[PDB]
Design a protein around this ligand. Structure first.
Ligand SMILES: CCCCCCCCCCCCCCCCCC(=O)OC[C@H](COP(=O)([O-])OCC(O)COP(=O)([O-])OC[C@@H](COC(=O)CCCCCCCCCCCCCCCCC)OC(=O)CCCCCCCCCCCCCCCCC)OC(=O)CCCCCCCCCCCCCCCCC
Ligand SMILES: CCCCCCCCCCCCCCCCCC(=O)OC[C@H](COP(=O)([O-])OCC(O)COP(=O)([O-])OC[C@@H](COC(=O)CCCCCCCCCCCCCCCCC)OC(=O)CCCCCCCCCCCCCCCCC)OC(=O)CCCCCCCCCCCCCCCCC
Ligand SMILES: CCCCCCCCCCCCCCCCCC(=O)OC[C@H](COP(=O)([O-])OCC(O)COP(=O)([O-])OC[C@@H](COC(=O)CCCCCCCCCCCCCCCCC)OC(=O)CCCCCCCCCCCCCCCCC)OC(=O)CCCCCCCCCCCCCCCCC
Ligand SMILES: CCCCCCCCCCCCCCCCCC(=O)OC[C@H](COP(=O)([O-])OCC(O)COP(=O)([O-])OC[C@@H](COC(=O)CCCCCCCCCCCCCCCCC)OC(=O)CCCCCCCCCCCCCCCCC)OC(=O)CCCCCCCCCCCCCCCCC
Ligand SMILES: CCCCCCCCCCCCCCCCCC(=O)OC[C@H](COP(=O)([O-])OCC(O)COP(=O)([O-])OC[C@@H](COC(=O)CCCCCCCCCCCCCCCCC)OC(=O)CCCCCCCCCCCCCCCCC)OC(=O)CCCCCCCCCCCCCCCCC
Ligand SMILES: CCCCCCCCCCCCCCCCCC(=O)OC[C@H](COP(=O)([O-])OCC[N+](C)(C)C)OC(=O)CCCCCCCCCCCCCCCCC
Ligand SMILES: CCCCCCCC/C=C/CCCCCCCC(=O)OC[C@H](COP(=O)(O)OCCN)OC(=O)CCCCCCC/C=C/CCCCCCCC
Ligand SMILES: CCCCCCCCCCCCO[C@@H]1O[C@H](CO)[C@@H](O[C@H]2O[C@H](CO)[C@@H](O)[C@H](O)[C@H]2O)[C@H](O)[C@H]1O
Lengths: 135, 53, 80, 383, 85, 103, 62, 105, 231, 168
């Protein structure tokens, strides 16, 4: 009595936002409602252009998120640990120095398991600071 | 504008009848077709003979 | 033909050879887009979406976007 | 039927008088049922009295058998009259719904009150005794008929689809019977033509093998409460009891030809309890008599000869076919002159669509000939 | 290691902590508030559903007499195998 | 004609689907959810330090310590707890004053 | 399911459809980010961090 | 696989034909049929009541795979230690001079 | 502890809303066998043998939205945890098993006692019965483990190969201008071939593993189904 | 009276402060467990009896008729005796919801009543205890709130090697 269990109990008029809805449906139907767009379990459509458009967009937004939210944490951790262990110590550097450090971190990422191991293993006799430099 | 088909399909799906093929019913109804005039004459002759008997 | 894994669909013939030979071709009635139609290159005469915008131009645009993405910090670095 | 404030007020006003009437009907129906039960226990067959066990051949699950666990008391007229049987059936329905409501109340304590408010706002599940005037009774009957309309088509479609997808009729007569059994109520079905479907379905599924979902649909169509459904052998027992009483009354009427002497309103009620005559159809005595005679003919001579009715599943489908209204179609034919995809017109045709139109348009033959000739020339050049 | 780190959810937003005692007590208060009113008799199925299983579990816990030691469920450090405390 | 999926609203259809179509599955799902929240809903501080942070635990600021400090301060202030009570310290107030004067 | 759709015959036709225009732009981005990385990460003036041995992920995860 | 039909009363072999671990438990040994598990298994197989052997097993597995498995894993008692910390039964009692509150009345 | 996160399907949810506001036929189904259980006509089952269709379709859709799109770089399989897959398979498998057990038909388990009367009951038939009742739970565990590990291994391999490709492409492309350009060209062609092969293999295996994930459940269902013959 | 709502807090506190559980309280809990098991057994016996009484005549004949699994002779005698006893008099053999109600409602009522009264008995027992748990129970019933850390407030007895904390 309070709420209807049937979908037929309309809450708005039939013409409410008719124009925008029709434009949205026009966008949806032009490429999808076609004979050659035979989906495989609703997930893989048959239209080539759908792949061509969506794959780049998905990759772009995922990569942007990864670069500006996920890898940034590792980069900041490296900068903090290698240059004082505190955020203020890093901020004491100039923008150019931070750029140099971040690009070295990118170098390490690109090297990974096939790059030279001198990037993280200090050769004996090296004059550069060790692990106990800030301790 | 074809209500019978709509209702039957919706009801079949709503009662767990997902399949969209009915080979048995089609086999029963596949050869159905309107008869020729000669076939009608033969059937009418058969019916007349049956009624006379 | 193919472009990577994308294959161009081909219409199956419907007319028999006898019927086909009796067909008279009149390209004058055909649209200007499809004249001297070639199944191996049906879109050779198809109009460009944007006049003067070549495929190589878009490829170079993408390359420039990548270069910007990689080099912007080198010119306008920002502090942590 | 959806709940309404007017129905809520009606039921609230008549709540206590309705309860008192229900109690009086309970006493009367207990007397009638005591008589019937004593007669069954005394003169009933050994199998019926001992409740012989019938198990399904696949999972060996017990269920009532139509032949053994159902018995028609041909000599019940001596002890119990037809009107008493009808009263007992109506009280059984009302008592079932009231028992479900009382069980909910006991289970949930005082937290069922808002659900009671929802209950009283709809006439679907209120007892008939809550109506103290003709108009209220008419509205209540309309609600019951609406529920029957809501439920029956699903049951019919379930039965028909399962059979047609898992089996086919043996002979042409069975094919005709099966096809004509599930016709819409707008047309009249000949019981003689449709009867063989009973034997066919007995070959496919008897009442002892009825599935739980189909049972739920049937109970919905018979205005029998289904929540909590529980095991299939509870609502199955309810259905068996109701149809056994109905068959006893039908045998009494057929033997004594009571329906001819039965008045208009009583005849309409008799048909309604058989799920043959909806009240919203405003049927006259001629139509009611036609439908009742069709029902009796469908029962067949064997019903009178030995008290054996046709398959209960097919019988229920046949009777409920009267609630299978033709699919609604509203709107003038002129509406077919409009267009559905005008909003896409602004988009036009892309290169692929233009190519498809060119190849499969009126010039399709010319394009096909040109393409085939070009391909043949290229192949010849290659060789 | 680095390859293994790539298999983590990438849309973590917030983390909330709550001691078992606190929210268990709050749930008990809610249950008591809803099961207290007189119009819900103790013999009703709802009240028994609410109370009996919890009572049985707590009684089983109380009766427990184990010869071994069960370290505290909510220690600060449970990653050390040689330090149950 | 009436059909659950077409005529009923979404909550009603959901209830019907998980009560008269897949009731056992819903029951098992609720059972599993209860088990998960009863036995797999705790994480010690050491576990969080080892694996609970994307790039690693920032020991240089120890956020866990600040979180616990805020928790305990809020509890003490709201509940009016006398942290100087002998049970918390194991010694009398006078002994505490003597120790403060000593150290 | 890869049933149909516009398929450019060669590079020059990628401008005959907006979707393939976006696709070729994306391919240009993809392939051109590599030369940029070559130039940037093999530059003469690029210098390794002097404190690179102060800390590394290898000691952290170990 | 295929449908199962219960054997008729006349198709069931006599009990005396059943064999135990060593031999048939005929007269003077009938009461040993209760204790011989193999004899009971053979009798059930002969009477086509094979479920008596299979139903208890499968269910048991389920009971272990669902409820007792985790109960044992999370709340089970491990092996006792060599040096055992028994209870001195000194804790709990109220101290001397304490005035307990009165009971409800 | 309560962690608030979101699945990686928001864009796909938006696309589903955009493209499926209107009806469309479905004709290609990864696991089509869930719709055709009976192949010999006149056979019918009183058990709800078509109850698995909806769950099968939803699971296929969900796992395809996750796994197939995970090939795209940086795409995350949010559900990729061993015990979470265990929970999913537990739900499905145990739900169907309890559906069969709640039927309260003990004869349904007669086939568990493998073999014939001619084999020792205690020492042969009963042991094999124990082993088979163990094999049921092992089938559940195997389904979930296979689904987890195929994905994990494939994505580990893809990440490693992509790292190698990035390394050689970035830090050794200058060899094109040097006298040893032929070696670099050969290596680059090999890497491209391997890249294509890996992508094709992953695309095929992602769909095959779903075929098999649903086939195990359907096999569980079929192991307890009995068909009657129409007469 | 609803004792469970009061007793849940006390049980949780005892679990949290189970160290101060005297052997008397442990015996009380063991007795509660034993009485729960006894209530379950009697309720099951009642349910089985109601099921047997309402069973159909054919069902009883099938269950308590030939063949005999053991065929010792005592089994057949007992089955025949029970069958004759059940089939001699008239028995109300309902089916469906009726049998469900008849078999369950008595069982549920019996089990719930026994358990509720045993809970009341346990509450009384804890009230009569002279241990810290008894004092906590009395304080809970008086003030209506559970006083945590009560054992250390009133300085409940501790082992001789653990009285240092009280040294103040
Ligand atoms: C206080 C404690 C509470 C405990 C918790 C309870 C929780 C709620 C559960 C439900 C309890 C019952 C609710 C009241 C129902 C009304 C009475 C009744 O049975 O009506 C008949 C009717 C029987 O249905 P049927 O299908 O026709 O029966 C087929 C038989 O073949 C029928 O046989 P027949 O064909 O031969 O015909 C016989 C018929 C012939 O009679 C007639 O035709 C005349 C009419 C008679 C019936 C009248 C019913 C009137 C109902 C409405 C009452 C007024 C409501 C007013 C509401 C507003 C108030 C302001 O007479 C009968 O119907 C007799 C049935 C047999 C008796 C059943 C009662 C047993 C329990 C009572 C005794 C308890 C003793 C305790 C001892 C303790 C010792 C320690 O009841 C029903 O409709 C069935 C109940 C529907 C709801 C079911 C909900 C699930 C229940 C699960 C229970 C599981 C066990 C318990 C534990 C639960 C844990 C979760
Ligand atoms: C004084 C009176 C006299 C005395 C008392 C007498 C006795 C009375 C009691 C007995 C009455 C029985 C008859 C009742 C009939 C009416 C039933 C009914 O409800 O009909 C639908 C009824 C309308 O009926 P109708 O319009 O007449 O249509 C009937 C048709 O025939 C349509 O028919 P249909 O068949 O299509 O409808 C059926 C539908 C009925 O359902 C519905 O229609 C759904 C109703 C709810 C829809 C809610 C939609 C709105 C949601 C809003 C969400 C919140 C929004 C934001 C709010 C912000 C607020 C600030 O589906 C079902 O039946 C499904 C059944 C599901 C059963 C579930 C069983 C679970 C068992 C668990 C598993 C156990 C396994 C074993 C485990 C064993 C372990 C040992 O629905 C409503 O009226 C909706 C009411 C919505 C209220 C507002 C939203 C909820 C407010 C909650 C407030 C909470 C406050 C406290 C919060 C505390 C927080 C800490
Ligand atoms: C987009 C998101 C939207 C929002 C989503 C929200 C989230 C949902 C997520 C989860 C959804 C799925 C959950 C599934 C769970 C598993 C279900 C399952 O396994 O079911 C198997 C199975 C399926 O049922 P079925 O009998 O085969 O048929 C179900 C069909 O729906 C029958 O259909 P039908 O067409 O055949 O029948 C139609 C019609 C036919 O008409 C009738 O049957 C006549 C009228 C019957 C009235 C009821 C009679 C009841 C008799 C006694 C039943 C036994 C009681 C046992 C003792 C009490 C235990 C509590 O029946 C009705 O209209 C039924 C009306 C019921 C209305 C109540 C529905 C629930 C609405 C919410 C209210 C409670 C909110 C609590 C939480 C909030 C608190 C602040 O369940 C049963 O056997 C039923 C057992 C019911 C036992 C009682 C309920 C136990 C659960 C706890 C209750 C707590 C009450 C708290 C009160 C307030 C305290 C403050
Ligand atoms: C139809 C179903 C279809 C679907 C099935 C779906 C499931 C699939 C199957 C596999 C299972 C999957 C598991 C899923 C999760 C389910 C939940 C779960 O696992 O929870 C376990 C979980 C176990 O407890 P726990 O917390 O894990 O740890 C154990 C604690 O001790 C807990 O402490 P507590 O206080 O709760 O104690 C509970 C107690 C169980 O219940 C009790 O509290 C005590 C026992 C109650 C007895 C009930 C009545 C028995 C029958 C009476 C007679 C009837 C006939 C009357 C006529 C007689 C005429 C002469 O259990 C025990 O600790 C064992 C007690 C042993 C007592 C006997 C001592 C041994 C010596 C005496 C016997 C041997 C004599 C031979 C001597 C030699 C001669 C030569 O909870 C329970 O289930 C226990 C509480 C509930 C007990 C209910 C009692 C009533 C049982 C009636 C059954 C009747 C039907 C069975 C036969 C059917 C034949 C056709
Ligand atoms: C908030 C409340 C919470 C409540 C929780 C309690 C549970 C829920 C309560 C009830 C809920 C309502 C719905 C229940 C189901 C209704 C089913 C139905 O529709 O039946 C219709 C049916 C009526 O149809 P009918 O045509 O008259 O007859 C049926 C045909 O025979 C049918 O013919 P058929 O061809 O189908 O024949 C087959 C039929 C034949 O059976 C029957 O139909 C006969 C009736 C049942 C007999 C059951 C007893 C069998 C003998 C037991 C012997 C035990 C000895 C143990 C000795 C131990 C010594 C130490 O079925 C069977 O063969 C099944 C046999 C049972 C197998 C049990 C297997 C259990 C496995 C356990 C695994 C391990 C568990 C964990 C570990 C435990 C140990 C540590 O109803 C009945 O016959 C009886 C219904 C009884 C309903 C249950 C009553 C509940 C009472 C509860 C009292 C305690 C409350 C505690 C509350 C605690 C605080 C909250
Ligand atoms: C780094 C370490 C890694 C370790 C990994 C280990 C594997 C972890 C895998 C997790 C994911 C997969 C989970 C699958 C599901 C597992 C289920 C499981 O075992 O859970 C059991 C657990 C056991 O529960 P429990 O733990 O509360 O048991 C209590 C037992 N005592 C009191 C003795 C301690 O079940 C639950 O968690 C749910 C319980 C509530 C729901 C059931 C209530 C009804 C119970 C009926 C019987 C008893 C009452 C009487 C009858 C009814 C009366 C009304
Ligand atoms: C049931 C309330 C009893 C007490 C009276 C409270 C009156 C409060 C004042 C309300 C004024 C505004 C009313 C506007 C119309 C409301 C219409 C309505 O309820 O429709 C429900 C409608 C959905 O209907 P359908 O399911 O689509 O189909 C309905 C047909 N069966 O719900 C909505 O859209 C939400 C509308 C909310 C309106 C405000 C309701 C406020 C109720 C407050 C109750 C508590 C007491 C208030 C006392 C106030 C004293 C000054
Ligand atoms: C409807 C039934 C109503 C019954 C009402 C009461 C009937 C008369 C009393 C029955 C006997 C009670 O006697 C009962 O004996 C057992 C021992 O056997 C005691 O039990 C004691 O020893 C057992 C030994 O295993 C321990 O498990 C248990 O923890 C301990 O308390 C109970 O604490 C006592 O209550």
């Amino acid at each position: 009595v309070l709420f209807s269990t049937y979908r037929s109990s309309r809450l708005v008029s039939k013409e409410f936002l008719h124009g925008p809805v029709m434009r949205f449906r026009a966008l949806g139907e032009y490429y999808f409602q076609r004979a050659w767009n035979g989906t495989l379990n609703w997930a893989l459509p048959g239209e080539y252009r759908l792949y061509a458009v969506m794959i780049p967009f998905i990759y772009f937004y995922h990569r942007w998120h990864n670069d500006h939210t996920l890898d940034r944490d590792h980069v900041e951790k490296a900068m903090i640990m290698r240059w004082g262990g505190t955020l203020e110590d890093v901020r004491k550097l100039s923008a150019k120095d931070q750029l140099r450090v971040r690009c070295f971190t990118d170098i390490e990422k690109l090297y990974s398991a096939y790059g030279p191991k001198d990037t993280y293993l200090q050769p004996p006799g090296d004059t550069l600071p060790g692990k106990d430099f800030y301790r | 504008w074809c209500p019978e088909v709509r209702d039957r399909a919706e009801l079949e799906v709503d009662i767990t009848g997902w399949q969209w093929w009915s080979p048995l019913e089609e086999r029963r109804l596949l050869p159905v077709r309107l008869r020729s005039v000669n076939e009608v004459r033969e059937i009418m002759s058969k019916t007349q003979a049956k009624k006379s008997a | 033909y193919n472009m990577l894994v994308f294959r161009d669909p081909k219409r199956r013939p419907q007319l028999s050879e006898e019927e086909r030979a009796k067909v008279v071709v009149n390209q004058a009635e055909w649209p200007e887009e499809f004249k001297d139609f070639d199944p191996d290159d049906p879109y050779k005469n198809s109009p460009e979406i944007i006049k003067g915008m070549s495929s190589w131009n878009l490829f170079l645009w993408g390359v420039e976007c990548a270069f910007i993405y990689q080099f912007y910090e080198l010119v306008f670095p920002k502090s942590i | 039927m959806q709940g309404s404030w007017s129905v809520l007020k009606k039921n609230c006003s008549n709540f206590f008088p309705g309860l008192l009437a229900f109690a009086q009907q309970t006493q009367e129906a207990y007397g009638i049922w005591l008589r019937i039960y004593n007669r069954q226990q005394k003169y009933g067959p050994t199998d019926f009295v001992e409740q012989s066990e019938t198990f399904s051949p696949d999972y060996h699950k017990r269920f009532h058998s139509q032949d053994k666990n159902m018995w028609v008391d041909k000599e019940l007229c001596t002890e119990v009259s037809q009107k008493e049987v009808a009263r007992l059936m109506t009280y059984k329905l009302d008592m079932w719904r009231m028992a479900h409501c009382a069980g909910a109340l006991l289970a949930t304590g005082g937290y069922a009150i808002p659900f009671g408010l929802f209950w009283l706002a709809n006439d679907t599940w209120v007892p008939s005794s809550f109506n103290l005037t003709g108009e209220e009774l008419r509205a209540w009957r309309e609600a019951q008929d609406l529920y029957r309309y809501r439920s029956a088509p699903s049951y019919l479609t379930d039965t028909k689809w399962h059979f047609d997808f898992h089996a086919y009729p043996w002979n042409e007569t069975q094919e005709r019977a099966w096809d004509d059994l599930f016709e819409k109520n707008d047309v009249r079905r000949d019981p003689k033509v449709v009867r063989p479907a009973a034997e066919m379905y007995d070959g496919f599924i008897k009442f002892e093998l009825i599935r739980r979902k189909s049972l739920r649909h049937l109970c919905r169509s018979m205005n029998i409460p289904t929540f909590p459904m529980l095991a299939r052998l509870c609502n199955g027992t309810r259905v068996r009891d109701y149809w056994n009483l109905a068959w006893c009354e039908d045998y009494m009427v057929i033997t004594q030809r009571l329906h001819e002497s039965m008045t208009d309103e009583e005849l309409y009620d008799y048909a309604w309890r058989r799920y043959l005559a909806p009240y919203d159809k405003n049927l006259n005595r001629e139509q009611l008599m036609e439908r009742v005679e069709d029902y009796f003919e469908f029962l067949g001579p064997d019903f009178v000869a030995h008290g054996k009715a046709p398959n209960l599943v097919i019988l229920t489908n046949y009777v409920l076919g009267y609630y299978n209204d033709p699919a609604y179609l509203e709107g003038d034919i002129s509406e077919l002159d409009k267009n559905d995809y005008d909003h896409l017109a602004s988009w036009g045709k892309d290169a692929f669509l233009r190519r498809l139109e060119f190849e499969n348009g009126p010039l399709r033959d010319q394009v096909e000939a040109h393409t085939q000739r070009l391909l043949a020339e290229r192949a010849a050049i290659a060789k | 290691s680095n390859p293994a780190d790539h298999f983590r959810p990438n849309l973590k937003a917030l983390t909330l902590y709550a001691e078992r005692q606190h929210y268990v007590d709050r749930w008990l208060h809610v249950k008591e508030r809803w099961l207290a009113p007189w119009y819900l008799p103790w013999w009703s199925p709802l009240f028994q559903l609410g109370t009996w299983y919890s009572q049985r579990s707590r009684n089983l816990f109380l009766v427990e007499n184990h010869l071994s030691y069960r370290p505290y469920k909510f220690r600060r450090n449970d990653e050390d195998r040689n330090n149950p405390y | 004609v009436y059909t659950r999926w077409k005529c009923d609203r979404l909550p009603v259809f959901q209830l019907k689907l998980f009560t008269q179509e897949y009731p056992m599955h819903a029951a098992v799902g609720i059972f599993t959810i209860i088990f998960l929240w009863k036995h797999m809903s705790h994480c010690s501080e050491e576990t969080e330090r080892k694996y609970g942070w994307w790039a690693g635990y920032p020991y240089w600021r120890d956020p866990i310590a600040r979180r616990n400090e805020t928790k305990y301060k809020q509890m003490i202030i709201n509940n009016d707890v006398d942290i100087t009570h002998p049970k918390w310290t194991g010694c009398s107030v006078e002994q505490l004053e003597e120790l403060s004067r000593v150290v | 399911m890869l049933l149909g759709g516009f398929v450019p015959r060669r590079f020059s036709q990628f401008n005959r459809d907006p979707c393939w225009m976006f696709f070729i732009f994306s391919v240009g981005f993809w392939l051109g980010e590599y030369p940029a990385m070559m130039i940037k990460y093999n530059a003469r003036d690029l210098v390794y961090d002097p404190h690179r041995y102060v800390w590394s992920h290898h000691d952290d995860h170990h | 696989g295929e449908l199962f039909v219960r054997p008729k009363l006349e198709e069931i072999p006599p009990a005396d034909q059943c064999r135990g671990f060593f031999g048939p438990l005929n007269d003077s040994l009938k009461f040993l049929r209760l204790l011989d598990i193999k004899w009971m298994m053979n009798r059930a197989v002969a009477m086509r009541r094979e479920y008596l052997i299979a139903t208890p097993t499968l269910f048991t597995f389920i009971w272990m795979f669902t409820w007792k498995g985790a109960v044992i894993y999370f709340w089970g008692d491990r092996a006792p230690p060599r040096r055992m910390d028994w209870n001195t039964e000194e804790t709990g009692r109220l101290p001397l001079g304490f005035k307990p509150t009165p009971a409800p009345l | 502890m309560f962690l608030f996160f979101f699945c990686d399907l928001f864009w796909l949810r938006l696309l589903l809303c955009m493209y499926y506001c209107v009806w469309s036929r479905l004709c290609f189904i990864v696991y089509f066998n869930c719709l055709m259980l009976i192949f010999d006509f006149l056979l019918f089952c009183l058990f709800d043998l078509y109850l698995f269709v909806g769950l099968c379709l939803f699971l296929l859709l969900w796992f395809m939205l996750f796994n197939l799109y995970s090939l795209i770089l940086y795409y995350c399989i949010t559900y990729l945890n061993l015990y979470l897959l265990f929970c999913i398979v537990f739900l499905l498998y145990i739900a169907f098993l309890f559906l069969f057990c709640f039927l309260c038909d003990f004869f349904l388990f007669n086939n568990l006692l493998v073999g014939d009367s001619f084999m020792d009951v205690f020492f042969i038939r009963f042991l094999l019965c124990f082993l088979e009742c163990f094999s049921l739970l092992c089938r559940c565990l195997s389904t979930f483990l296979r689904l987890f590990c195929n994905l994990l291994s494939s994505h580990f391999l893809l990440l490693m190969f992509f790292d190698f490709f990035y390394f050689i492409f970035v830090f050794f492309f200058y060899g094109v201008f040097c006298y040893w350009f032929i070696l670099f060209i050969f290596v680059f062609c090999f890497c491209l071939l391997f890249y294509v092969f890996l992508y094709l293999l992953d695309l095929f295996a992602a769909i095959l593993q779903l075929f098999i994930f649903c086939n195990m459940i359907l096999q569980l269902i079929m192991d307890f189904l009995l068909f009657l013959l129409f007469v | 009276t609803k004792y469970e709502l009061k007793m849940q807090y006390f049980d949780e506190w005892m679990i949290r402060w189970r160290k101060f559980q005297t052997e008397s309280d442990w015996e009380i809990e063991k007795g509660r467990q034993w009485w729960r098991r006894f209530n379950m057994a009697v309720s099951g016996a009642l349910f089985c009896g109601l099921v047997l009484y309402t069973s159909g005549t054919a069902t009883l004949k099938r269950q308590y008729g030939l063949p005999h699994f053991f065929d010792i002779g005592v089994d057949g005698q007992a089955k025949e005796t029970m069958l004759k006893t059940l089939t001699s008099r008239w028995r109300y053999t309902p089916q469906g919801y009726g049998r469900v109600l008849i078999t369950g409602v008595p069982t549920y009522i019996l089990f719930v009543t026994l358990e509720h009264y045993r809970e009341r008995r346990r509450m009384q027992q804890y009230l009569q205890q002279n241990t810290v748990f008894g004092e906590q129970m009395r304080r809970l019933l008086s003030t209506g709130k559970i006083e945590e850390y009560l054992p250390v407030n009133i300085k409940a007895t501790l082992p001789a090697s653990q009285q240092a904390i009280y040294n103040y």
